[PDB]
Design a protein around this ligand. Sequence first.
Ligand SMILES: O=C(O)c1cc(I)cc(I)c1O
Ligand SMILES: O=C(O)c1cc(I)cc(I)c1O
Ligand SMILES: O=C(O)c1cc(I)cc(I)c1O
Ligand SMILES: O=C(O)c1cc(I)cc(I)c1O
Ligand SMILES: [Ca+2]
Ligand SMILES: [Ca+2]
Ligand SMILES: [Ca+2]
Ligand SMILES: [Ca+2]
Length: 582
Amino acid sequence: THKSEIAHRFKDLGEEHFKGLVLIAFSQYLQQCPFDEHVKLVNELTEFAKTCVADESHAGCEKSLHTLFGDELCKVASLRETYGDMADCCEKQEPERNECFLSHKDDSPDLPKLKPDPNTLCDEFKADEKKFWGKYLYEIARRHPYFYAPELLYYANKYNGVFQECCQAEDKGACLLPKIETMREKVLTSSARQRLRCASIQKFGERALKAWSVARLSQKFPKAEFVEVTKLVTDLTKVHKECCHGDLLECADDRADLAKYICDNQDTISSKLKECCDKPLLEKSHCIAEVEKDAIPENLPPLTADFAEDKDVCKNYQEAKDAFLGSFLYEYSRRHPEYAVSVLLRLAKEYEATLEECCAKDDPHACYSTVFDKLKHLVDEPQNLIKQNCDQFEKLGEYGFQNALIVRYTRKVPQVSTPTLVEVSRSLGKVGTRCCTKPESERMPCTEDYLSLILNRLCVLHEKTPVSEKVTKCCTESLVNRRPCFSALTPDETYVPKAFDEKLFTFHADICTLPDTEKQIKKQTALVELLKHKPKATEEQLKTVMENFVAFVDKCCAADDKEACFAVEGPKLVVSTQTALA
Ligand SMILES: O=C(O)c1cc(I)cc(I)c1O
Ligand SMILES: O=C(O)c1cc(I)cc(I)c1O
Ligand SMILES: O=C(O)c1cc(I)cc(I)c1O
Ligand SMILES: O=C(O)c1cc(I)cc(I)c1O
Ligand SMILES: [Ca+2]
Ligand SMILES: [Ca+2]
Ligand SMILES: [Ca+2]
Ligand SMILES: [Ca+2]
């Protein structure tokens, strides 16, 4: 019995989750407002839902969630003061009003860094568990306004489980701290991934997210029929769409239905689902996401048969380009759980091009007969790139490898801003640690997938106020060729070196008194600057400059009166460095 969307969401999801989803919505839309105020919004909106559960015909209950929510945003008194043109949105009609609001969501918000102090935290948690859960929802959402919401609730539960276990113990910090750092990695990954999903939707169509999904599921569910994989992909894709347009109640609902659909059909999807399908809802959906792949069906025809050798290939393609191509991507991926989905979509796109050309020619079959070998370079390229880069990772270690990446990338695209260059090169530096030690069967999936993620963060940060047409080009050409494209950029000698700014290379006694993250960043920032100033420095010249810098920092940190020391050796470094790079 459903004619009120908000009555329906509230009945299906239940009050606790409803409130969590609503809090998240607001925290993602108004990233600057106090936690209190957001709680008040969530409570008025939840009472209005209750009134609707009670009478589904009460005035307003027929209104979509975007309508009701947007209406709540439009009542915030501090709205124009705190967010400006975001308040122009109020003069639009739905869906435009929600598109313009979406468009103000800040991807790199100027916010204090989260640094946990176990006593205050353990105390707050004992005082009020729900409210604790809630500020978690809040701060994380504030920092990731596109966080996949039902998954953020899952993490808020685990967060709670960790605090419930550890606060009991004697050494809180030693219990809390490792667990919180591990989870912080997992949250940052999660965040990245959903940002890529939304941005892909927003820039390349739903069709791209769909293709990716066919590839992913066809990998996990190699036995499932193309029809089943198709249905899964449709529902799952709709889920991502609702979450990317900010309708969280609906995304969480459709997701709960998907997990019900899956746990109810294991027999035609996968034998690896027995475990997952016995957990409570959030845990269940999460487990379904990360599930181990099932066995590949034992005797399978070669791909060559139906896609290169058959005589009707062109005819079949021509009757249903999409189903034919969908079938290609499905059939390739169920056989290769060891290729990265990025590679798989590249193979598929190559296949489409090959066909678009050959099916037009006088004798198509000879043109398409030999396509698979033409497909070979798309697998060879990134196998090689991986081997090569992990070596560099072996000797240098994380931070050495990051310095190489900062060098590479700064030469590559120097019109790009220092903070982004830095953030992105560091993150790229994490790929070796995350992947290189891996047994070969994962290594390509592991690296390519991670890089799409980091390169998407580059695009999203660059799209905002674009400075490198080179970047814009790599980011917006094809979603799937981002990596190769970026790998393919060579440095530019038209690039006129940037004028010398003393401000950029003056260092003070504060650097000794920095959390290490801030140390490495201050340095890495300096390195990026130097390379925008001296585009053509060489690897040895740069290594030496580095040696001089670390000697200098160590020296001045070590004296009991350091400000004098920096005040004196600092310009000595500048001189020396300018002489070396003269
Ligand atoms: O991302 C954070 O800022 C963050 C902060 C805390 I405290 C705990 C976890 I898990 C996080 O992911
Ligand atoms: O990404 C998800 O949230 C997700 C959720 C469900 I339920 C099932 C699969 I396969 C997924 O990939
Ligand atoms: O940075 C790259 O170009 C790169 C590309 C691939 I594919 C794998 C690894 I490890 C990399 O470091
Ligand atoms: O999980 C996904 O469905 C997904 C979708 C896209 I588009 C890109 C990456 I990396 C992903 O992991
Ligand atoms: Ca910003
Ligand atoms: Ca909707
Ligand atoms: Ca709907
Ligand atoms: Ca439902």
